[PDB]
Structure 1
Amino acid sequence: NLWVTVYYGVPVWKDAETTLFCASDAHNVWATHCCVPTEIHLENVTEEFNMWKNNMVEQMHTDIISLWDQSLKPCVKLTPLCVTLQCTNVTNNITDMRGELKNCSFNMTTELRDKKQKVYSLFYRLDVVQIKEYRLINCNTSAITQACPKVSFEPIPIHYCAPAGFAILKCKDKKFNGTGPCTNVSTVQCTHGIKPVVSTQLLLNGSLAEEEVIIRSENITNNAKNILVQLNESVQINCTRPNNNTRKSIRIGPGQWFYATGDIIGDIRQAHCNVSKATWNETLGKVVKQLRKHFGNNTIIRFANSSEVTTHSFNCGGEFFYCNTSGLFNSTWINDSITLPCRIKQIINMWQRIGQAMYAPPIQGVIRCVSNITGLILTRTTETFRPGGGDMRDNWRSELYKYKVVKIEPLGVAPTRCKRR
């Protein structure tokens, strides 16, 4: 003779997809976006996680693309530059690159409808396509928009926070490989501080593994999938563009300005990155040991050069570097440094789209940055692995793999011995 009793505030939940909002630790595009300023252990909860079927990654990806476009939307367009250029090579003080820099002159608009001006600027070879008669790339598909020089795209930590009624569960299993049950689950309000760093092949400034190198994949036997390798120790990489650049601001219209690369002071030298050699050899040895566990006890593993996918492709100081990683991925496993040459581009077709293009104003001075390699993206009777990637969602999966969003459903019933009357 038991009766139905209704309980509200019950600790029960279901998997869910919702809208997360961004918080931050209190100009920069994310600082403006992440307007909200900024852990409970569940003693006997086992929960199932799956980083490959997550929604947080899709939502983060969407927010980044959207914010990026919003940032460029109000900036001056460079459609006045889709004219024929007269380009010759820069020959002064060139070390040995040769055809990388060109001195281009052209007929451009002015603030008056009835007046024209002759200007010149330097361009990188990769941004200019030959028809001495040249034009900028694109100008056929997409218009080029100049990024505002006052807007910062420096990544800052982003904290995704649950809306009321929802919670984020975090997996603390030290060796969690992205899927399946996790026995160390805690509840959090915000997903830690994650930096939206954009690169391919080598993932910079992410989280480190705590005990060993961890290799994660959707299907380890499916050669079509990317393998995300999380390192337990970082590898330091020192990148620079040694040339002393200047900038010329050209009025192109009524309050509209174009930023052109001006004369380079001193020698023209190649941009490059210095990877510590001993650290790199130890790093791969650890990766290989963990790979052998999946590819065979006596399987020989070799690394090889890949075939804006084959390059590192990262944003350093605001410039876009396309470094040659073939200097790293070349070995067989059964004070020195590795110098990787880097190409520089100003016209960027970002996020694998072609209907839009950005022009990055040149940055004056000399640029240097030092970054932490925290993980690798690899693609697959010996085995050979190559760098891969380019799909940005796979970078974000490396930081959000331990989080899951659930909906709280605090209402239910159970039998007991009381009657209402």
Structure 2
Amino acid sequence: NLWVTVYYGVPVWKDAETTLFCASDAKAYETEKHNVWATHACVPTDPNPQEIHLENVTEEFNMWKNNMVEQMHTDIISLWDQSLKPCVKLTPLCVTLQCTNVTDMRGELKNCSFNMTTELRDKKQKVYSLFYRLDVVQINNKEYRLINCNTSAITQACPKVSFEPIPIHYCAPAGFAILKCKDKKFNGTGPCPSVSTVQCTHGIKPVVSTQLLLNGSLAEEEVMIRSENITNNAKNILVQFNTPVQINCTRPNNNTRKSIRIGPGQAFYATGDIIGDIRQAHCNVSKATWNETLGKVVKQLRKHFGNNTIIRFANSSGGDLEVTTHSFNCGGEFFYCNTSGLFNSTWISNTSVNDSITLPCRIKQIINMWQRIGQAMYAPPIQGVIRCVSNITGLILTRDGGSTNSTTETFRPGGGDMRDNWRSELYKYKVVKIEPLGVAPTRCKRR
């Protein structure tokens, strides 16, 4: 009896992948400071982002299969190179370094004398600088060299731009949509009872860190435990905190900028003498706040590893510095902190057997993150003492393979892949494409 009829705009979608753009909230642009991080031409965010809750809908999510992570990961990487392209390349810094021990703590800093090319190509320049032990390597008084020269080339980051993370909303173009999981407890896998849609994702700060998720999103009620394959010890375990952890990372060295001239037109910023406290970089964590969280977190692992079992914590096993330490950026400088003091504990079924704690941190200006070869970035010196306060919102953890599985299990800080850091904020999001065209049988026919 009936007849076919074309309906346009029916609620039908399929899971797919597209190219997502950013959103800066149109305030980051007023923050200026010559293109901070991403925001330059960055899409300002709709003042009123729209979130529509879909009733009577259940959708299955997988955060580990999420494509927004891979795009974001490649975005930061592509973003990094574009920042270093217009800046000043440090290529003729491979000159011999004659170094000596700084005036305590086994001479971590080296005072190095070397020859340099001036604006003119005729006469050289005899000048000295100050490099960390991590930035230099001796070759056989004490003679050193740049640590990256044998591996690759090097370029200096511009002092105008800042590495300051700013909120970035990922949005989808026309024909696409972004799904948001509104449940309080979600491990990133399984069906999602309450699903809402948004044009733009929430504020996401691209904070690059290791062993500690900084400035991230808090969980709801109970703390969350996420892992790709849990019984598998080869897979990292992502944790989401309820309450934020106060962390202080400072640069207890009050410095000055040389701004030496290697012209014509170019000026390099050398690290001058340190005026102030003679100290190594340090990281503070309040003993009461970390413990309280630990007691709550260690109980969540027993929802899997069993009601009663012994959970012991320990510092990093070994590997690259990026893996073994907490790597991040504060005030433009890159800190590498020793977390061994926090991870020293042993817990009972519900319990573990002072007013403050500190963590030794190391500073490295010349870095290759993401296993990049051919390009090394030099972090420019900062005037004065740098102080920063951030939230610790989560961790990257790995389980040991030694078993004795039915006895006890030990967990250690993870590292490596930075996608996990983005999976922390993107677990509730996935990309689907909308299929508007539809057909239905009805009597109307046509004349």
| TM-score band w.r.t. shorter chain | over 0.9
CA-to-aligned-CA distance 1:252-300 (integer Å, 9 cap, x gap): 1211111111011133211101101011111111111000111111211
> For the Cα contact (< 8 Å) 1:29–1:71, is it kept in 2?
no
Give me the whole-angstrom Cα distance separating, in 1, the residues matched to 2:36 and 2:81. Answer: 11
SS of 1:373's equivalent in the other structure is strand
Give me the whole-angstrom Cα distance separating, in 2, the residues matched to 1:267 and 1:403. Answer: 47
Give me the whole-angstrom Cα distance separating, in 2, the residues matched to 1:392 and 1:128. Answer: 26
- Tell me: CA distance 1:5–1:406, structure 2 relative to 1, closer, same or farther (3 Å): same
Give me the whole-angstrom Cα distance separating, in 2, the residues matched to 1:388 and 1:326. Answer: 13
> For the Cα contact (< 8 Å) 1:28–1:153, is it kept in 2?
no
- Tell me: CA distance 1:87–1:150, structure 2 relative to 1, closer, same or farther (3 Å): same
Give the equivalent residue in structure 2 for 1:373. 392
The 5-angstrom pairing of residues 340-379 of structure 1 reads 340-379=359-398
CA-to-aligned-CA distance 1:12-54 (integer Å, 9 cap, x gap): 11111001111111x2343534621111110111111110001
Comparing 205-214 with 136-145, greater Cα deviation is found at 136-145
Pairwise CA distance, 1:185: 0.5
Give me the whole-angstrom Cα distance separating, in 2, the residues matched to 1:2 and 1:148. Answer: 70
> For the Cα contact (< 8 Å) 2:37–2:161, is it kept in 1?
no
CA-to-aligned-CA distance 1:221-268 (integer Å, 9 cap, x gap): 110000000011011111111111111011112111111110111332
SS of 2:258's equivalent in the other structure is strand
CA-to-aligned-CA distance 1:165-189 (integer Å, 9 cap, x gap): 1110101111111012101100100
CA-to-aligned-CA distance 1:323-355 (integer Å, 9 cap, x gap): 001111111111622211101111111222232
Give the equivalent residue in structure 2 for 1:6. 6
Give me the whole-angstrom Cα distance separating, in 2, the residues matched to 1:386 and 1:185. Answer: 35
Give me the whole-angstrom Cα distance separating, in 2, the residues matched to 1:96 and 1:121. Answer: 20
**Candidates 328, 331, 336, aligned match of 1:314:** 328
> For the Cα contact (< 8 Å) 2:251–2:281, is it kept in 1?
yes
> For the Cα contact (< 8 Å) 2:214–2:390, is it kept in 1?
yes
Pairwise CA distance, 1:98: 2.2
SS of 1:282's equivalent in the other structure is helix
Give me the whole-angstrom Cα distance separating, in 1, the residues matched to 2:370 and 2:333. Answer: 16
> For the Cα contact (< 8 Å) 1:201–1:390, is it kept in 2?
no
SS of 1:14's equivalent in the other structure is strand
The 5-angstrom pairing of residues 10-409 of structure 1 reads 10-25=10-25, 27-33=34-40, 35-38=42-45, 39-90=51-102, 96-131=104-139, 132-307=142-317, 308-334=322-348, 336-380=355-399, 381-409=407-435
Give me the whole-angstrom Cα distance separating, in 2, the residues matched to 1:117 and 1:360. Answer: 23
Give me the whole-angstrom Cα distance separating, in 2, the residues matched to 1:332 and 1:190. Answer: 43
- Tell me: CA distance 1:342–1:278, structure 2 relative to 1, closer, same or farther (3 Å): same
Pairwise CA distance, 1:101: 0.6
Name the Cα RMSD after superposition: 1.2
Give the alignment's TM-score, normalised by structure 1: 0.97
- Tell me: CA distance 1:294–1:96, structure 2 relative to 1, closer, same or farther (3 Å): farther
Comparing 75-84 with 223-232, greater Cα deviation is found at 75-84
Comparing 75-84 with 188-197, greater Cα deviation is found at 75-84
> For the Cα contact (< 8 Å) 1:271–1:343, is it kept in 2?
yes
**Consecutive unaligned residues in structure 1, runs of 5 or more:** none
> For the Cα contact (< 8 Å) 1:24–1:34, is it kept in 2?
no
SS of 2:116's equivalent in the other structure is strand
SS of 2:299's equivalent in the other structure is helix
> For the Cα contact (< 8 Å) 2:335–2:364, is it kept in 1?
yes
SS of 1:48's equivalent in the other structure is strand
CA-to-aligned-CA distance 1:74-128 (integer Å, 9 cap, x gap): 11111111111111111xxxx9422211110111001112221111111101101
> For the Cα contact (< 8 Å) 1:8–1:410, is it kept in 2?
yes
> For the Cα contact (< 8 Å) 2:62–2:188, is it kept in 1?
yes
> For the Cα contact (< 8 Å) 2:282–2:361, is it kept in 1?
yes
Give me the whole-angstrom Cα distance separating, in 2, the residues matched to 1:220 and 1:209. Answer: 20
> For the Cα contact (< 8 Å) 1:22–1:34, is it kept in 2?
no
Give me the whole-angstrom Cα distance separating, in 2, the residues matched to 1:97 and 1:205. Answer: 32
- Identity level (%): 98
Instruction: Count residues in correspondence.
Output: 416
Give the alignment's TM-score, normalised by structure 2: 0.91
> For the Cα contact (< 8 Å) 1:82–1:136, is it kept in 2?
yes
Give me the whole-angstrom Cα distance separating, in 1, the residues matched to 2:135 and 2:182. Answer: 46
Give me the whole-angstrom Cα distance separating, in 2, the residues matched to 1:77 and 1:177. Answer: 45
> For the Cα contact (< 8 Å) 2:38–2:79, is it kept in 1?
no
Give me the whole-angstrom Cα distance separating, in 2, the residues matched to 1:34 and 1:281. Answer: 44
> For the Cα contact (< 8 Å) 1:29–1:67, is it kept in 2?
no
CA-to-aligned-CA distance 1:190-236 (integer Å, 9 cap, x gap): 01110000110111110000111100011111100000000110111
SS of 2:87's equivalent in the other structure is coil
- Tell me: CA distance 1:285–1:185, structure 2 relative to 1, closer, same or farther (3 Å): same
SS of 1:289's equivalent in the other structure is helix
Comparing 48-57 with 354-363, greater Cα deviation is found at 354-363
Give me the whole-angstrom Cα distance separating, in 1, the residues matched to 2:23 and 2:252. Answer: 37
Comparing 145-154 with 409-418, greater Cα deviation is found at 409-418
